[PDB]
Design a binder for this molecule. Structure first.
Ligand SMILES: [Cl-]
Ligand SMILES: [Cl-]
Ligand SMILES: [Cl-]
Ligand SMILES: [Cl-]
Ligand SMILES: [Cl-]
Ligand SMILES: [Cl-]
Ligand SMILES: [Cl-]
Ligand SMILES: [Cl-]
Lengths: 265, 264, 264, 265, 265
């Protein structure tokens, strides 16, 4: 319910924000703890250190309205983003103690298997819908999980909603971007599953995503905050000896172009 | 229908939002553990093991104060944004699947054959009957084509239906009828194989335009918008038994409509 | 043919709808169980194990009661919408296939090599003979190229035919002739390998335009529209014997035509 | 070299050339001899009959200049090509004595594995750069192979150059199109590797490749010759009993559109 | 930032630079030494001969500015590049002593597995961000590796920066292009992982990459130097007997088209 007026131009009417988000795979430096697997659907008690979570940050922008009593005020409008997964070339490492190919004689398996990549740029926290594979899962304290009162949580229960308002706390497996909300956020997600699937990861500085909607309006930054969200699961690392697996995530870089937009107060 | 001009001005457009939960054979995203015949006859799949199409009819706002005039208005579906919801649930490798690396690694994610379809129309989706095995005995509580001979394994033009009941028309014995559906747009993809990686996008930035060559979208007969889908995402394998279950995910729809004048 | 102007006005356009059922070696979507030679000679594939091209000539409304005038009319095919029918049958994993997960999981779906072709023309599709094994003995009841030497394994320009009989020209010994077919458009894809996932779209929203670089579609000689296809979707494996059968699916065609004036 | 002037139009100013090249996989009829494999890098002595080679032909064009002493002359200019791999549907054969699937009970493996497809259209022979996987390889009598004096032949040694001037004589594995030359040829190549990779082979008569460069100039046919080159390795055939493998290649059709082009003489 | 003025046209205002870079896989001629694999994360001591490194070269350009104090000066602007991996067809070799398919009876495995391809064109050295898979790795004498003082080196530690200023010295696995810098370079990278993944390698002379940014400005060559960078890991070669694996890399050709650009000094 924001009445959007004209773009405000002139000196200092545009700015570019640069930020990076480190991955939250369950521990702080790119890997989950070795993943444990329940023998049945109940009990199913995944430790916090084994659950990849969304990354998020609010970037404070230059204050626009010392006076909020005028019939019009200014908002920062996100018009475009360049975003990069950082450290893709680390997956050329086949010497750091993974399970060896060619019956033990070849190199270590690279990081491989299921991939899940999402980035989002908005003027407020990303809106989430709760959904899980197993409604009987006992989620750990210190992650935010939807309430699991019945099996409808395995499909769409519209009572299960959240905002992505804490970095490294909302597990990827029990929340997805809510397509029924997020009027003021653009999100872009991919999942490529399978067991030992080859990760396919580009890295270029030449690609821009335009964030304008049908009316030529980008996300409008409420309270002069820019909201960045992502997850970048790149596959599993297998330990050579134990053969236990760890999620591997990589950091993401954002460059967001903003302009001043007049709106009705 | 003789299609005339778009009616513009206040309240001439609306957006309909809806979601459809998947009908994989039980109500909460999974089939019952799938059984497999030892021969083509008898072949008796239980209802709880057969994925079915999801469908809904949304009653639309009143737009005609009279239905006897030489022109009337219909809601015209211009575009749709649609999303498979819960794609990130497939990052779960702890909930009691068959373990990789000889039992030492994580559980297999949901994987294998995928079948994704959505449709938006102004009347029920029209189906053509077709089966893999004409000897199959379909269960009580589903709508299956009559199977009188083996031509049901290819195209028997006698085997037609309308998708008019949610969770009742099995995916494996009906497909969208390309000879009908003048007033519905459908979009389907099948990706088969045994352990195939599911590839599932999730974004709020992609719009499908529903206009035909003449610039006319589906026209909502009886002020009904008809949504249909299936989203089989693969199989869940039980760690101990190694039995498999179909997994389906819900689908969200946002449909943009405008008022269209037509000859009555 | 000297092609002149498009004839417009009432009844200047028509749409032809047709379907072709697959010819995999038996009448209802499957080959007989496939046998495999132990050497290149003898190699004697039965007719029931050899997929063949589907084809039909559709009679169009007669245009020229008088064929003596300096100009006459021909039907010109401008576009086609075509669909493989029954794609969703490949969601069936209960009808007696080899079971995954060591016998505990579902049946393998139909998978492996795929070969899909459709063609629309104003005369029969022109074929080039080419085989994998020049020593193959092709059976009675199919049309196969003569095999007098091993050049038949590559391009022997002496080996030509017209697709003039439904279910009679094996796919493996004939391909569309790129040196002919001036008056036919053909569109073919082969995806090989052993257990390869079939990837099969099904939509009513995709149109193929048949106009050449000069804006002219196939011209229907003698008021005949010629439709051809093959749709090998993979192999079905029998649970017990583990023998394999080719699976094919039917194909639907909707062809838009317009009247074109030509010099007589 | 050539100062390019105007396109010559009017009657007889255009022509279409149709040709086919049969594959040269090591024997004349689509297959290599069964392939033998060295136990070490030295000695490594591949027989000619086991080495796929490039196909090539020069097509004579209508003679344009009885008098080659005028200040301007005409050249045939290649503007576009339609090209097709012929015999793709042969790969639906699963009965002709290959290794059987389903533990011997199913159909024969189709032709599968590494694919290499190239076509080229030019106004002079295709220019080649020598490059090998093993500089210790002894190439056979009856093929043209680069001299192998040191291991730089495994990467780029700019001393190792050739012209594709003989059909079925230049092995694919020791020559590639030279990107530093070929000003007057367009080449188009794809390699898809791996062990049992599915071949993906289109066949249509509806696809045209334009051969014009950034200046709107196609290959200019020196001496009224059109030069066609290709290779089409479609994978390996496995013999049911021995399990030895043969390269399989398919023939390629070309239709080339030419127009008369005035040049400075 | 440079204030960019008009393109300078006229005779000698454009030039084309051609160059090739041979790969640096750990030895001089296209292959790493046989790769060794640690049994644990510490110690993990990859020899230099087993670590693929980036290729780079500075190409000297014609000197533009006799007086470097004028209010405007000229810079060479890179507007487009044609780039080719050379030697792709060498991967059709299945005779040179690899592990044999069909249980020893078939041909040798071709080069296959993880691929990593990057090319970059800039007016200064490519800027790098340090990131590793294992912060406990001991990088060898003779390579430039980021300092590894804690596990943040496995994600984005913004302290870990470098410039690609030496050919065959910066390992691919511990450096990636820095998306927070490189304003004056265009880089284009792909990684395709997995164990035995088919390499997919095109080779054509018909494809041009435009290097102009959103404002129509290509990289500007500081000190009249053009900076070229790449890596082309094409997979692993498996030795038939030992079954040890070697990285295989291929050389890359560049053709860069430049024009003179006026800039405010
Ligand atoms: Cl303003
Ligand atoms: Cl941090
Ligand atoms: Cl529900
Ligand atoms: Cl029939
Ligand atoms: Cl002229
Ligand atoms: Cl010949
Ligand atoms: Cl100038
Ligand atoms: Cl060098």
């Amino acid at each position: 319910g924001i009445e959007v007026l004209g773009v405000r131009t002139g000196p200092d009417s545009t700015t570019t924000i640069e930020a990076y988000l480190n991955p939250r795979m369950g521990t702080d430096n790119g890997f989950s703890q070795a993943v444990t697997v329940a023998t049945s659907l109940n009990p199913d008690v995944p430790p916090k250190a084994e659950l990849p979570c969304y990354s998020c940050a609010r970037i404070g922008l230059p204050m626009l309205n010392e006076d909020m009593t005028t019939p019009e005020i200014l908002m920062w409008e996100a018009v475009s983003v360049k975003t990069e997964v950082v450290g893709v070339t680390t997956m050329c490492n086949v010497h750091s103690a993974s399970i060896r190919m060619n019956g033990g004689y070849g190199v270590g398996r690279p990081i491989e298997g299921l991939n899940c990549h999402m980035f989002a740029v908005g003027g407020e926290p990303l809106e989430l819908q709760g959904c899980v594979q197993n409604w009987s899962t006992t989620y750990p304290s210190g992650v935010v999980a939807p309430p699991l009162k019945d099996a409808k949580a395995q499909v769409l229960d519209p009572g299960l909603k959240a905002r992505l308002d804490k970095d490294g706390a909302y597990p990827v497996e029990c929340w997805c971007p809510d397509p029924s909300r997020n009027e003021n956020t653009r999100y872009f997600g991919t999942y490529t599953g399978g067991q030992q699937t080859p990760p396919v990861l580009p890295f270029t500085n030449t690609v821009t995503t335009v964030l304008l909607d049908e009316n030529g309006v980008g996300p409008l930054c409420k309270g002069d905050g820019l909201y960045l969200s992502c997850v970048d699961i790149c596959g599993f690392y297998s330990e050579q000896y134990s053969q236990k697996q760890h999620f591997r995530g990589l950091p993401r870089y954002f460059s967001v172009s903003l302009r001043k937009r007049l709106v009705r107060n």
